[PDB]
Amino acid sequence: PGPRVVVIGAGLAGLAAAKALLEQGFTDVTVLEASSHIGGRVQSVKLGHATFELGATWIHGSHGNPIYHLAEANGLLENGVACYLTNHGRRIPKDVVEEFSDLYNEVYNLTQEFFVNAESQNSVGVFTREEVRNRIRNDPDDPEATKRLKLAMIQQYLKVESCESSSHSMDEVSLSAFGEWTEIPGAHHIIPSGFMRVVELLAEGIPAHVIQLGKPVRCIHWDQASGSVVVECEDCELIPADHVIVTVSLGVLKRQYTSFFRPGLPTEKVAAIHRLGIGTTDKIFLEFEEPFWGPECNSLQFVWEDEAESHTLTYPPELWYRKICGFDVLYPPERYGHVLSGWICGEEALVMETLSDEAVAEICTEMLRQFTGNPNIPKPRRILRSAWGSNPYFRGSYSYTQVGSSGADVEKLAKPLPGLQVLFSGEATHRKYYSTTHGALLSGQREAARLIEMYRDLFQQS
Amino acid sequence: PGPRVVVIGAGLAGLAAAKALLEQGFTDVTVLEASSHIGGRVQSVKLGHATFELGATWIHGSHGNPIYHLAEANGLLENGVACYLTNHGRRIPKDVVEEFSDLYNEVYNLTQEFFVNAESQNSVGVFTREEVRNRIRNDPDDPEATKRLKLAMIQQYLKVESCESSSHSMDEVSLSAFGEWTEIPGAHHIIPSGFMRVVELLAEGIPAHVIQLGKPVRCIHWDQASGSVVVECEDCELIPADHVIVTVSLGVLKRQYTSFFRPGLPTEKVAAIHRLGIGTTDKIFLEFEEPFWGPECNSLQFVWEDEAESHTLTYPPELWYRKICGFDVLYPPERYGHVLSGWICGEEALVMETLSDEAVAEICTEMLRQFTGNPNIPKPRRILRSAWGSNPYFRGSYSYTQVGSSGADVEKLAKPLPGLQVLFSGEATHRKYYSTTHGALLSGQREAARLIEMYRDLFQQS
Ligand SMILES: C=C=CCNCCCC/N=C/C=C(\C)N1c2cc(C)c(C)cc2N(C[C@H](O)[C@H](O)[C@H](O)COP(=O)(O)OP(=O)(O)OC[C@H]2O[C@@H](n3cnc4c(N)ncnc43)[C@H](O)[C@@H]2O)c2[nH]c(=O)[nH]c(=O)c21
Ligand SMILES: C=C=CCNCCCC/N=C/C=C(\C)N1c2cc(C)c(C)cc2N(C[C@H](O)[C@H](O)[C@H](O)COP(=O)(O)OP(=O)(O)OC[C@H]2O[C@@H](n3cnc4c(N)ncnc43)[C@H](O)[C@@H]2O)c2[nH]c(=O)[nH]c(=O)c21
Ligand SMILES: Oc1ccc(Nc2nc(-c3cnc4ccccn34)cs2)cc1
Ligand SMILES: Oc1ccc(Nc2nc(-c3cnc4ccccn34)cs2)cc1
Ligand SMILES: [Cl-]
Ligand SMILES: [Cl-]
């Protein structure tokens, strides 16, 4: 028949791998997808004539980005100030916000010269914040009331950083000569029609029989003495294979590696799985009848005055809501309506995922009332939100550079099992583009290219 | 190697099968048992120097019973009146109980002449009760107060019958010339040391490596084009086999047959699985500090005066307790202490299994107070009870003759799949001894004898 290839997962990596193989005339290819849908951590949701992204939101980069090339080639591409509010209703002055912002940028840049690896990243933030904290307290020409606001903004800024995959994702943005945090102009693009359109363009080539939806794998049996690999599905089907490409998230690997592989994985790969970090990042959309936020406001930034002294990382499960750093006003209102877009990251995101919509909605409304100083804000007409952490096909949003891991661990995760029987793909297997759509895509093409090369050589031999 | 034989389950049928094969020099035998223990629906529990049975309690029969032969050969074998109480505390007179008992026995025997199959069984009870109900109401020489008691005892007697596997299990007992329900003398024997001792005597022959405890099967793959059978365990191990003997309960088959077999079972077997009935029967033990029941009382029989008109079968989930027909006083007190032994059968048993011990205990204590007329009865020191229905390795206590099934369905369940690739054992596969320990044992020996015969012939051929 030619090589039997099972691709596990139909996110960007799985589809990229399958397309690349089929493009090379690989006849005997099957994709097994656990969920009812393709796209994985690309999940687009339509409400009215407007799309909301629950997963991947922006295309990072331009020329060279193969997902930018897709979006651009099929024509899928194309205000105010941020409003800092205290938990006692009062708004923080332009001056105070600008002063803090300037101090932080000065210290963060001076510090990043001082200290490019995963452990050394952490040190920048830790010592930045200590140095910023010292200068605020030490500044003799500041009233004590204002010092307590600025010190609380350290905790606010820390919540903003929490959602980032690296320091390098936070090295895109720099501070403007007029106190605003300006991103590089052509860096981040949205797809108004939805990010799923890219998934569908990628899947277009692939025949319909290849992709098996609602078909999760239970175990990969490799090193067999017919196919020397056997894929065991949850519905108990035994699929013989020559090669397998695993694209499931690092979070799936962390929870299932002991059962998922027979025999067990080599111990350096198991160590890599443990050492590498995957974070839970969820999106919360709050659609209101009309805007209670001022027209100058791009966003509503939450500075809790009682967090001046805290060096907190994780909140208790009652204070999960305190992990939200603020809400962005979606523009334009005509496309999206009056919708606030929020992010929550880490253990507090898993706590949010357990709550019902009416509960999450209520707590966000309570927050917004307290911060705005208007207690009359109605409950939002609609709410939309993700649950990547508790979903057993994801168990996380994206891989990040954890203190006590390295680029060495990604190479170890990405390394194939002997005879290329089992190949490792997915965002977390990409050395430099991990936690992105293009990393996911390129990782799929890498493992495909590996089998492609193996059988160009068995044509060049034979 | 000689034939690879996987036996699924290490209850009486699985052990009987494995022993019989090994006795015949079958080298390559494995038993896979889901639970941590052997014995299955034989489960013995020690408290003090005394054993309580949660499953199989009595050896039914003597000479010819191969479980009697075991018990007898290893030397493991060797009061008052039943007290009928109303839910308003008052005790029902000797006369009233004897009169009812005589009427019922007369009608039940006259009726059983009128109508030996599974559907025709049901008709006996239905018309017995209607005829008994008529004569009570019709009797001109009875006060109305007494008629309402006797009519409630129909519902009581119906609860007693509910726990029986057949009419033939209720054809052992007959009525004495002095109004008592007398069992045949040498019919039922207990094992004071515990029923598990029989399980252990049966397992004695078998080497330790053969039985894999804590090892449930997920799927049997048969009809494979190495072993033409593959047993798929829950921990994802693939065990190649030539023959498999399935001994799991009818309840396990009802819930799992669609996933458990690949390809699917022949449709007459699937029909047999649906047609055959398995009931949930649980035991409740209530150990008290001292006896509040009178010394004349073998048992405390519960007659609810408000059930005179009802033709109930299933109670709602709040009235689950009403399915208990009474409690037996265990004899002798020196062995067991002051322990009441109760039975609950059907859907109401599953409702009991969901409740906590403190809850079940409380409701039984409440019942006992109301019926005795003593509200001062303390909460029992200990409680012990079974959960056969909710246990996923049982999902029932024993197979019964359901209206709309026949002996034909048992033959259909018991029939092996082609090439004797998969063999069907267990109590519910025995034509006449279903719902017994000896039926279970003999069913195991039958499937063993089948493979034994197959390979005496492949020795006589070769
Ligand atoms: C002013 C002001 C302030 C504004 N601040 C701006 C800061 C913004 C910084 N950028 C942030 C971007 C985020 C957060 N973005 C973001 C947000 C959020 C909420 C998420 C969740 C992610 C992202 N990323 C990451 C990507 O989405 C992710 O890497 C890829 O989709 C993964 O593809 P894959 O490897 O194939 O895995 P998959 O999991 O997709 O596929 C594997 C499949 O396997 C299946 N499966 C599982 N188990 C199985 C089994 N047992 N058997 C069979 N199948 C099985 C499973 O169902 C899947 O379909 C982003 N990327 C990007 O490019 N742009 C972005 O903006 C974001
Ligand atoms: C005065 C006055 C009034 C007094 N009234 C007197 C009336 C009394 C009438 N007699 C009543 C008797 C009862 C109720 N008795 C009674 C009471 C109660 C509460 C019960 C629960 C039963 C009974 N019976 C029935 C037997 O116990 C039963 O038939 C056998 O144990 C079954 O053996 P097996 O077929 O091998 O199955 P198993 O299930 O045991 O074995 C299969 C194994 O498979 C395992 N398994 C499941 N799934 C698996 C997977 N996926 N992979 C691997 N393994 C898996 C599983 O864990 C098991 O170990 C009795 N029999 C008897 O002889 N005397 C009796 O007294 C009673
Ligand atoms: O694409 C972006 C990203 C961020 C922002 N805006 C804000 N950034 C920060 C912030 C926190 N920590 C640091 C460290 C370095 C630089 C910025 N920051 C606070 S608000 C706008 C556009
Ligand atoms: O091994 C036994 C079984 C039962 C009893 N005692 C009682 N049996 C009945 C009863 C109900 N229905 C019928 C129909 C026919 C015969 C009896 N019964 C009520 S109390 C004692 C020993
Ligand atoms: Cl969006
Ligand atoms: Cl007992």
Short mmCIF file of C-alpha atoms in Angstrom, two decimals, chain A residues 16-277:
data_model
loop_
_atom_site.label_atom_id
_atom_site.label_comp_id
_atom_site.label_asym_id
_atom_site.label_seq_id
_atom_site.Cartn_x
_atom_site.Cartn_y
_atom_site.Cartn_z
CA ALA A 16 -0.21 20.84 8.17
CA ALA A 17 1.37 17.34 8.54
CA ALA A 18 -1.48 15.51 6.68
CA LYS A 19 -1.53 18.13 3.80
CA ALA A 20 2.31 17.98 3.39
CA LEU A 21 2.25 14.11 3.25
CA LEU A 22 -0.76 14.00 0.81
CA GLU A 23 0.94 16.77 -1.31
CA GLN A 24 3.89 14.25 -1.54
CA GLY A 25 1.49 11.47 -2.79
CA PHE A 26 1.20 9.65 0.59
CA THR A 27 -1.95 7.59 -0.27
CA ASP A 28 -2.49 5.76 3.09
CA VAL A 29 -2.91 8.75 5.55
CA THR A 30 -5.56 8.97 8.36
CA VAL A 31 -6.07 11.89 10.86
CA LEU A 32 -7.77 10.89 14.21
CA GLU A 33 -9.39 13.95 15.97
CA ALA A 34 -10.85 13.59 19.52
CA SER A 35 -13.33 16.54 19.20
CA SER A 36 -16.29 16.99 16.75
CA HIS A 37 -14.41 19.96 15.05
CA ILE A 38 -10.98 20.63 13.35
CA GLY A 39 -8.70 23.61 14.27
CA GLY A 40 -7.95 22.68 17.93
CA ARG A 41 -6.82 25.86 19.82
CA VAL A 42 -8.16 27.84 16.79
CA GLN A 43 -11.89 28.20 17.71
CA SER A 44 -13.98 30.98 16.03
CA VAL A 45 -17.57 31.79 17.28
CA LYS A 46 -20.13 33.86 15.22
CA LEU A 47 -22.70 36.16 16.97
CA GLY A 48 -24.68 38.46 14.60
CA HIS A 49 -22.47 39.37 11.57
CA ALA A 50 -19.27 39.29 13.75
CA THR A 51 -16.78 36.55 14.89
CA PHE A 52 -15.31 36.12 18.44
CA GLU A 53 -12.09 34.06 18.89
CA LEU A 54 -12.02 31.72 21.96
CA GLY A 55 -8.47 30.49 21.09
CA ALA A 56 -5.81 31.98 18.73
CA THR A 57 -6.71 35.68 18.10
CA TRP A 58 -3.77 37.44 16.24
CA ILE A 59 -1.29 36.51 13.45
CA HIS A 60 2.10 37.53 15.00
CA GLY A 61 4.41 38.79 12.20
CA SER A 62 4.23 39.36 8.41
CA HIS A 63 6.72 38.29 5.61
CA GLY A 64 8.02 34.75 6.45
CA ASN A 65 5.02 33.82 8.68
CA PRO A 66 3.36 31.00 6.66
CA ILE A 67 -0.05 31.74 8.37
CA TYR A 68 0.29 35.45 7.36
CA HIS A 69 1.07 34.17 3.78
CA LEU A 70 -2.23 32.10 3.87
CA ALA A 71 -4.40 34.95 5.36
CA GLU A 72 -2.87 37.60 2.98
CA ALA A 73 -3.12 35.31 -0.16
CA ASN A 74 -6.92 34.67 0.33
CA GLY A 75 -7.52 38.38 1.26
CA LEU A 76 -8.59 37.73 4.92
CA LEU A 77 -6.64 40.74 6.46
CA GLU A 78 -6.90 44.60 6.63
CA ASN A 79 -9.59 55.17 19.26
CA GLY A 80 -8.75 56.50 22.80
CA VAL A 81 -6.57 55.75 25.92
CA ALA A 82 -6.47 52.98 28.63
CA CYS A 83 -8.52 53.98 31.78
CA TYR A 84 -6.90 52.99 35.15
CA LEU A 85 -9.62 52.68 37.88
CA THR A 86 -9.28 51.96 41.68
CA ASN A 87 -11.51 49.35 43.49
CA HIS A 88 -13.06 52.29 45.52
CA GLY A 89 -14.60 53.71 42.26
CA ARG A 90 -12.06 56.61 41.85
CA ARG A 91 -10.09 56.87 38.53
CA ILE A 92 -6.24 57.15 38.66
CA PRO A 93 -4.99 60.43 37.05
CA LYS A 94 -3.13 60.56 33.64
CA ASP A 95 0.01 61.89 35.50
CA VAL A 96 0.16 59.00 38.07
CA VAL A 97 -0.36 56.31 35.32
CA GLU A 98 2.25 57.96 32.99
CA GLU A 99 4.84 58.41 35.86
CA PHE A 100 4.53 54.72 36.94
CA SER A 101 4.62 53.53 33.27
CA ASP A 102 7.84 55.60 32.62
CA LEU A 103 9.56 54.36 35.88
CA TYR A 104 8.72 50.68 35.06
CA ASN A 105 9.94 50.98 31.40
CA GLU A 106 13.22 52.62 32.61
CA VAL A 107 13.88 49.89 35.25
CA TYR A 108 12.68 46.96 33.01
CA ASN A 109 15.09 48.03 30.17
CA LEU A 110 18.08 48.82 32.52
CA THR A 111 17.46 45.36 34.14
CA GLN A 112 17.16 43.46 30.77
CA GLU A 113 20.70 44.77 29.86
CA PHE A 114 21.98 43.40 33.26
CA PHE A 115 20.58 39.91 32.28
CA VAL A 116 18.62 35.19 26.80
CA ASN A 117 17.26 31.97 28.49
CA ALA A 118 14.17 30.66 30.42
CA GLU A 119 15.54 30.99 34.04
CA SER A 120 17.29 34.41 33.43
CA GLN A 121 13.95 35.81 32.02
CA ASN A 122 12.28 35.40 35.50
CA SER A 123 15.10 37.38 37.26
CA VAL A 124 14.32 40.50 35.05
CA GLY A 125 10.72 40.77 36.42
CA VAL A 126 11.63 39.91 40.08
CA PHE A 127 14.40 42.60 40.33
CA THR A 128 12.55 45.12 38.05
CA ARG A 129 9.59 45.06 40.53
CA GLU A 130 11.86 45.23 43.68
CA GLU A 131 13.79 48.22 42.18
CA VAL A 132 10.50 49.96 41.03
CA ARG A 133 8.99 49.26 44.53
CA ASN A 134 12.12 50.81 46.21
CA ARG A 135 12.06 54.05 44.10
CA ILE A 136 8.25 54.61 44.64
CA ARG A 137 8.59 54.23 48.49
CA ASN A 138 11.92 56.18 48.38
CA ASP A 139 10.62 59.13 46.21
CA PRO A 140 10.51 62.07 48.72
CA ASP A 141 8.32 64.29 46.40
CA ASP A 142 5.18 62.03 46.33
CA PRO A 143 2.16 62.05 48.73
CA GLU A 144 1.59 58.68 50.55
CA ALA A 145 -1.91 58.31 48.90
CA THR A 146 -0.25 58.29 45.39
CA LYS A 147 2.60 55.90 46.47
CA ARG A 148 -0.08 53.30 47.53
CA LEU A 149 -1.71 53.58 44.01
CA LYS A 150 1.64 53.20 42.10
CA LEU A 151 2.66 50.18 44.30
CA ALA A 152 -0.74 48.50 43.47
CA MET A 153 0.00 49.04 39.70
CA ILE A 154 3.10 46.73 40.10
CA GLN A 155 0.59 43.92 40.97
CA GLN A 156 -1.61 45.09 38.01
CA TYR A 157 1.40 45.04 35.53
CA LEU A 158 2.35 41.56 36.95
CA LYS A 159 -1.16 40.19 36.01
CA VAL A 160 -0.63 41.56 32.40
CA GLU A 161 2.76 39.70 32.14
CA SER A 162 1.17 36.43 33.55
CA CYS A 163 -0.59 35.66 30.19
CA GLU A 164 2.65 35.87 28.10
CA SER A 165 4.39 32.71 26.70
CA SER A 166 7.85 34.42 27.09
CA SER A 167 9.76 37.71 27.66
CA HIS A 168 10.13 37.84 23.79
CA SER A 169 6.28 38.17 23.40
CA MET A 170 6.58 41.23 25.82
CA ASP A 171 9.68 42.57 23.85
CA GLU A 172 7.37 43.44 20.85
CA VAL A 173 5.61 46.33 22.76
CA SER A 174 7.69 49.44 23.78
CA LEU A 175 6.76 52.78 25.52
CA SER A 176 5.86 55.87 23.36
CA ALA A 177 7.43 59.34 23.96
CA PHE A 178 3.88 60.35 25.22
CA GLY A 179 3.54 57.59 27.89
CA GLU A 180 1.41 55.00 25.91
CA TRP A 181 2.45 51.28 25.45
CA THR A 182 2.71 51.14 21.57
CA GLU A 183 2.93 47.75 19.70
CA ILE A 184 4.99 47.54 16.41
CA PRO A 185 2.55 48.66 13.63
CA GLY A 186 2.39 45.56 11.31
CA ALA A 187 3.06 43.00 14.11
CA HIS A 188 -0.47 41.74 15.05
CA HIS A 189 -3.32 41.20 12.50
CA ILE A 190 -6.89 39.89 13.18
CA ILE A 191 -9.00 37.96 10.60
CA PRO A 192 -12.48 39.64 10.79
CA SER A 193 -14.11 36.61 8.99
CA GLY A 194 -12.54 34.37 11.75
CA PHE A 195 -9.21 32.53 12.43
CA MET A 196 -11.03 29.20 11.53
CA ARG A 197 -10.90 30.40 7.83
CA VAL A 198 -7.07 29.74 7.94
CA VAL A 199 -7.76 26.24 9.43
CA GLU A 200 -10.27 25.62 6.55
CA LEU A 201 -7.81 26.93 3.86
CA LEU A 202 -5.14 24.53 5.31
CA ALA A 203 -7.69 21.59 5.38
CA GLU A 204 -9.01 22.41 1.83
CA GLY A 205 -6.53 20.07 0.01
CA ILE A 206 -7.30 17.07 2.31
CA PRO A 207 -9.93 14.46 1.20
CA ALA A 208 -12.98 14.01 3.55
CA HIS A 209 -12.40 10.23 4.31
CA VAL A 210 -8.88 11.01 5.83
CA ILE A 211 -10.05 13.06 8.91
CA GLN A 212 -11.96 10.95 11.53
CA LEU A 213 -13.70 13.44 13.95
CA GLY A 214 -15.03 12.34 17.40
CA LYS A 215 -12.27 9.62 17.44
CA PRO A 216 -9.89 10.09 20.45
CA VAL A 217 -6.80 7.78 20.84
CA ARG A 218 -6.36 5.93 24.20
CA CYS A 219 -2.91 4.29 23.62
CA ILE A 220 -0.07 4.12 21.03
CA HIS A 221 1.52 0.60 20.97
CA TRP A 222 5.02 0.89 19.36
CA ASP A 223 8.13 -1.38 19.21
CA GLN A 224 5.91 -4.38 18.13
CA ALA A 225 7.57 -7.68 16.93
CA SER A 226 1.47 -6.46 9.85
CA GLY A 227 2.10 -2.95 11.33
CA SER A 228 4.87 -2.67 14.01
CA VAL A 229 2.68 0.20 15.48
CA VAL A 230 -1.00 -0.17 16.67
CA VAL A 231 -3.15 2.90 17.61
CA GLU A 232 -5.76 2.00 20.30
CA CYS A 233 -8.83 4.35 20.09
CA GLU A 234 -11.21 5.00 23.07
CA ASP A 235 -14.03 3.14 21.15
CA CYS A 236 -11.61 0.10 21.23
CA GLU A 237 -10.72 0.12 17.45
CA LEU A 238 -7.14 -1.19 16.74
CA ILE A 239 -5.57 0.79 13.80
CA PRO A 240 -2.27 -0.78 12.55
CA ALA A 241 0.35 1.83 11.44
CA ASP A 242 4.00 2.14 10.23
CA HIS A 243 4.43 5.74 11.59
CA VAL A 244 2.32 7.92 13.98
CA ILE A 245 2.51 11.76 14.33
CA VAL A 246 1.34 12.89 17.84
CA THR A 247 0.11 16.58 17.85
CA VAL A 248 -1.90 16.61 21.18
CA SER A 249 -1.01 19.54 23.55
CA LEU A 250 1.75 19.35 26.22
CA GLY A 251 -1.16 19.40 28.77
CA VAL A 252 -2.61 16.17 27.24
CA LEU A 253 0.93 14.60 27.37
CA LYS A 254 1.41 15.64 31.08
CA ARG A 255 -1.88 13.92 32.15
CA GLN A 256 -1.77 10.77 29.90
CA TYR A 257 1.88 9.86 28.90
CA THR A 258 1.97 6.89 31.43
CA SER A 259 -1.10 5.20 29.75
CA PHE A 260 -0.76 6.75 26.21
CA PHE A 261 2.53 4.94 25.23
CA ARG A 262 3.39 1.18 25.39
CA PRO A 263 6.21 0.66 26.02
CA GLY A 264 6.79 3.81 28.19
CA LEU A 265 8.59 6.84 26.64
CA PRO A 266 12.41 7.16 27.05
CA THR A 267 13.13 8.89 30.40
CA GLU A 268 14.70 12.12 28.92
CA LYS A 269 11.38 12.72 27.01
CA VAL A 270 9.37 12.02 30.25
CA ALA A 271 11.70 14.51 32.07
CA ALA A 272 11.09 17.09 29.24
CA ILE A 273 7.27 16.61 29.59
CA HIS A 274 7.60 17.36 33.38
CA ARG A 275 10.08 20.28 32.96
CA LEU A 276 8.15 22.14 30.17
CA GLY A 277 5.22 24.35 31.35
#
